[PDB]
Symmetry: none
Subunit: 352 residues, 4 copies
């Protein structure tokens, strides 16, 4: 009665059902509803998470247990990472457990890797598609993603499906050139009509023109020093710039120039966040600048209004979105996939 | 590569690997190590549980998330139950170094086995299987997997000393079904089924019994003090496992108060959890100083503090700990064959 | 000169209370403040009374457990710090500690109270906050006697406030205790204060001697650290024509219980709602509810009794009995402490200048 | 039986009457070291996680912090409150420290947190300085520069002048406004007549830079959100030792020392001295904005567990950086010591509480 959906199976389901329309009509609505559902009864749906460092002498992994009990999506996400897993290349490893919302029976076990990357990319586009519609005329023709891996992949993939006619060049930036070139190839083979280039953080002058010709910038890095520099971004107010930052999850992690973060604060710009509580306790871009909850707006709240001059720096046309991750994202998207994935893309277990 | 171990897979592995030697040499030591490991750094090994009642309508189910991070057994047991009744969930086993998913167990059989293994872990220490003053009958109040695994493990351990097993329940159907499965399995043992009200019929069997097990969700004591053997020449070990909330009780509160006022220490799995969940201790007013943990019985002596000298009776109350499920789940995961598991590649 | 702090000692609190406690004062001043605190807390619980910190002493020569209970209400900000345990009980100290009152805007220290009298008064004020609402002082179905199980300050303030409120309706007060010494001392002190009321002292074992008074009683108070029910169902009046209100305050740990567990189970199976101060704290601290299996849905908070008028959910029609269980809330100590600090005269306080 | 209210003036009295080089080394510093080491041994059992709650009043911007400490010998709680409104009124962080009986939990002492916090913070600063830069050192510049004013700067300077009497000849107080700086120069001048006290503005760089380049001890007591202590203002000769104790930062957006020096120290593998690696990495902007990790940090008590200090010294300059965020054990161990040693002349004793 349970289904084990592996990382490959998730990517299969997504690749088979992810289109511009599907994102707008199926995926995004579920995530928006989950984010709104969570915001209504936050402490009852996502109880305080349990974080425990490994009690094994041969491991530096920290295990975090994040339960989610929504009216419709019930379960638990357990993710684990740290130096050893990072150095070994495994990174954050774990799974998402989906339960019956009425009985509590085990219905699905997902691999958290792909699921986390997809829900994070769907959250980034949930705000991007709201502030910069795909019919907008103020979009520069290039996209720059700082980072590699599943996070950068799904961010690029989803954005290329949404802004197909407007994005012609994708620039992948990373600390090491190996994994960046690996992503450039995989994305190049998948999207033939898009030119994919890979740069190193030191190849400034070489990517700086591309960064100044970019309207969508993605932060998918575990950086402790800002990789997106204010002087590398377009400063023309006629063109809109939407920066979705997802990499930082600790106060010492930051991706966007702290001067720009302070400039946005002093200029009265509200930053888009997934959760004001978590971002002001986990996002170094906000923690190191002294941002307050009143100068923040949550993604679901962007769909409750149409006035967005509060989230835009009028001197440059720049908008900042910071995502830290929420278990409702994993549970609402995992429940959706579980109820629509075919047995060809799932390990169905009978008599569990 | 993770492995889905279903209830049938667990019972298969267990029935295929459970012997007196296996219990004494492999299974019991793992639980003792888990209980000992937990007792050293309790809040670091088993963090406080997360309990949230359904935020969904048309449901009265409460979901409980119990993480366990031992040096060797890492994961979480998620159980959910409540009105509209049973308790369903699963146990997740992770790689102790990477945090990758290694195993998914069904909590049903795994919980019953570890509870029965915990009951015998204290029993075999106080009433060794080589005892010569052991009454020949066993009485288990309850049915289901809990009663089954309790009886099977005890009958494998005290084979030559236990000749009659009496199954007691509120309904006689599930009692006779357990008599059948255990009767076909143990041909040299007489299995009898009784009702909780048929006192005049089971009182002789209860007074000819040295092992009494409480596997019932009763809210009123089903094991009565005057139905037990009171001869100081014979030892009696009562393991209570059914109660998990303060309003649930299985053993006569008069016997509980006599043991308290006579200075008898009750064997427990965890003093903290039992004094917050077991009605036998909460409704009698027991204190931590008059309690002893199962793992502590293997690190010291008894001093007869866990035995009432006027009756020869020993009382053990177990409420359950996540370390029990994960230490036994890791052992099964590392020893279960691919025939008894759903092996998933490239998870 | 600078900023000033106020040290209000136990004697200072009792002086203020004895000098300002009247039927009108309780109805018009003290109870209203407590009701507002309970309602304010119920609105934003986790922000006003944050989760308490409990730590057992890290000293070897000590078995004391320290509890830190902060309260940040819109008007009453501070913390109540209480510490107790076996050694504290063996020495007669019991729960010792203090209540800190802060400036609601700046956070400067304004007052330091002794927790003893303050806790006892607010607990008794909570009992009458529900009692005066369910059993009005003009009620016509009330027996003429009151029975309090226990002695000490808790029993004292419970009796005193109830006798100031129900002057003509309570004629005999029966004090029950494990020892008769402390019971007779309370009869004396309360007898000197209330001349028109008959005070009698009995032992918990002198059944048949107090049962007639217990069956002629409409208000029963539980002020005992009992771990075994001292208020037994067969000693209480079971006549539905007479109203009985049982306010229990003694139990604060799951193994502590004051009311017959049979009656607790009878109330559960009959669908009766029990009055509590806080559903969360009572279901985690009161043995009367934890050992009976009570649920939040079959409970009602005291302040909520002022949000409805259908008290048939809190009354078992088979007996006419109502049960109220109090475990304690930090908001109670601070809302009453803030009131006292803002109304105490310099004669009944040690005013410290330039703190 | 009685409790004791110890007011700010009472604390300053007791300290001024009992603070000497020997007293600091033989009584005050040892108590703080024991508290810091005792805390590090069983941290979560002595100082449980603090409760922080913002005002639920609509007419206040103050946030209240409740910090209990349950050590084997010092038991109680520190309550501090601050915020925008409190700072705009000259109040700042206000609160008190409660000392309880270590066996019964009865109220034994109530301190004002203001002076008590400043003293223990200054005692923490000197606990690391006296270990890395002994008072007999010959590579100590003769000037001291303190960035900040108030109680923090006062106790920091006083303690250093009692300890390095023969080595400190000029003290320069720097602040944004000259008012509180001139008041501090006066009070400290009357106490230390043989020391030259000067007051400067944060903008008078051309006037204090020569003094800053002749300074070996620099104290940061400012609530700055932008670094006021600039790398180009420090002495760069490795032949002279420089010890910088930073005290102002308590939130990640607050920084006092040039982030270039913080970034250089990190990339050059220099370990910075801290009171607690956990709290500093969650509250100190000098460490959070530099990306420092616990492995590149050393705690104050740990400086007394070794004798090689080349890991905490930049060899290119001879500079050592120490960052303090505050720990409740410091307030409670100093509150217990004073309460158990203060005479009734410097305390308001309340009987029959
Ligand atoms: Cl396959
Ligand atoms: Cl307690
Ligand atoms: Cl915090
Ligand atoms: Cl803060
Ligand atoms: Mg909303
Ligand atoms: Mg001392
Ligand atoms: Na409520
Ligand atoms: Na000179
Ligand atoms: Na490391
Ligand atoms: Na050490």
């Amino acid at each position: 009665h349970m289904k084990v959906i592996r990382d490959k199976d998730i990517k299969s389901f997504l690749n088979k059902r992810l289109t511009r329309e599907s994102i707008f009509s199926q995926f995004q609505p579920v995530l928006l509803r989950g984010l709104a559902t969570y915001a209504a009864n936050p402490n009852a749906i996502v109880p305080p998470r349990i974080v425990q460092q490994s009690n094994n002498s041969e491991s530096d992994t920290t295990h975090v247990f994040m339960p989610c009990i929504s009216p419709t999506e019930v379960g638990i996400k357990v993710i684990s990472g740290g130096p050893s897993n990072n150095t070994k290349g495994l990174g954050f490893q774990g799974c998402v457990m989906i339960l019956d919302e009425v009985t509590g029976e085990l219905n699905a076990i997902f691999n958290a890797a792909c699921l986390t990357a997809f829900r994070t990319a769907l959250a980034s586009v949930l705000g991007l598609t709201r502030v910069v519609p795909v019919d907008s005329v103020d979009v520069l023709p290039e996209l720059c993603v700082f980072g590699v891996g599943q996070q950068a992949y799904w961010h690029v993939k989803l954005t290329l499906l949404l802004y197909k006619e407007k994005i012609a060049k994708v620039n992948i930036l990373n600390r090491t050139l190996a994994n960046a070139e690996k992503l450039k190839e995989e994305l190049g083979k998948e999207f033939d009509n898009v030119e994919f280039r890979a740069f190193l953080f030191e190849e400034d002058e070489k990517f700086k023109p591309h960064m100044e010709n970019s309207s969508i910038i993605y932060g998918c890095t575990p950086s402790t020093s800002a990789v997106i520099k204010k002087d590398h971004l377009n400063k023309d107010p006629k063109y809109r710039k939407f920066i979705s930052l997802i990499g930082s999850y600790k106060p010492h992690m930051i991706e966007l120039d702290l001067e720009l973060m302070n400039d946005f604060k002093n200029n009265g710009v509200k930053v888009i966040v997934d959760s004001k509580e978590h971002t002001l306790h986990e996002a170094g871009e906000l923690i190191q600048s002294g941002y307050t909850s009143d100068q923040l707006i949550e993604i679901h709240e962007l769909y409750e209004t149409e006035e967005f001059s509060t989230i835009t720096d009028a001197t440059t046309g720049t908008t900042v979105q910071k995502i830290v991750g929420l278990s409702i994202m994993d549970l609402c998207m995992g429940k959706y996939i579980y109820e629509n994935i075919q047995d060809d893309d799932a390990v169905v277990v009978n008599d569990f």
